[PDB]
Amino acid sequence: GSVDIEVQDLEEFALRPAPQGITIKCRITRDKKGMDRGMFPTYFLHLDREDGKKVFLLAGRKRKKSKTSNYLISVDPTDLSRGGDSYIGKLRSNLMGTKFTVYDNGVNPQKASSSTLESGTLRQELAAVCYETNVLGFKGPRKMSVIVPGMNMVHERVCIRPRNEHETLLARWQNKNTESIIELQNKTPVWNDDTQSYVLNFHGRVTQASVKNFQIIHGNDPDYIVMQFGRVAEDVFTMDYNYPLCALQAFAIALSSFDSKLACE
DSSP states (O other): OOOOOOOOSHHHHHHOOOOTTOOEEEEEEEOSSOSSSSOOOEEEEEEEOTTSOEEEEEEEEEEESSSSEEEEEESOHHHHTTTOOOOSEEEEEOTTSSEEEEEOSSBOGGGOOTTGGGSSSBOOEEEEEEEOOOOSSOOSOOOEEEEEEOBOTTSOBOOOOOSSTTSSHHHHHHTTOOSSEEEEEEOOOEEETTTTEEEEEETTEEEEOBTTEEEEEOTTOTTSOSEEEEEEETTEEEEEEOTTOOHHHHHHHHHHHHHSSOOOO
16 A cells, blocks of 8 residues: 555654554654754754655754753744754763663653652653663674563553663663563664675565664564665665554664764764
8 A cells, every 4th residue: 555644743753653564664864054063963853655756754953951962852843943952852862872861841750740750741661771781792683672662452552651770761671671661672783695794584585784773673573664864965864664663763862873882974
């Protein structure tokens, strides 16, 4: 079929998990300024219609709130283009650029009033990414972990609103709490003797693996590609995602790769 993905309300679309059986194909474009006189670059996510037309979905840009520089993800390009701190998603990274968490626009647990703290309105964690650190002797492709909220019987996300440090996605992951989360990982690339490099297979095309070219899958079924991200030009990348991911999660995961410890060349 074709399935002309229905995009009406951008906030709703951004949070909508991709229907099983339908792949949502997008493209991420890097700003209009970029490496200049400071200012961080702005990334744009557009739906790539199979008719040749594009549809703006989200925009992301790094910002320096107080000390750390998180990415604000908004469905309002204009606002973000300036001091517009309006957002639907926020990407937070550790100092090393090895751990990332994506939140919605709810209230931070650590600053919540007693009235809010009753549970509700509290910030949700939509995804977390960990770029595995080198051990010392282990030989092989680096590991990328992606943690997302579990899905319920109706195939909808089971809202994760951490009330404390032990309820975050990264904590549930490290503690093995697999009840309300889904642990995903990058698909292991395979050494190709002709290219003399580790490769991945994007729709039949040999693709050199890197932080700029990867696929996310569930460890139990390597054939089902949850997310496929690849560089097609200097500042242009293709991004396709499938259930259980929504655009905000996929986009955030992609933004993390730009801000990761890796990505240096």
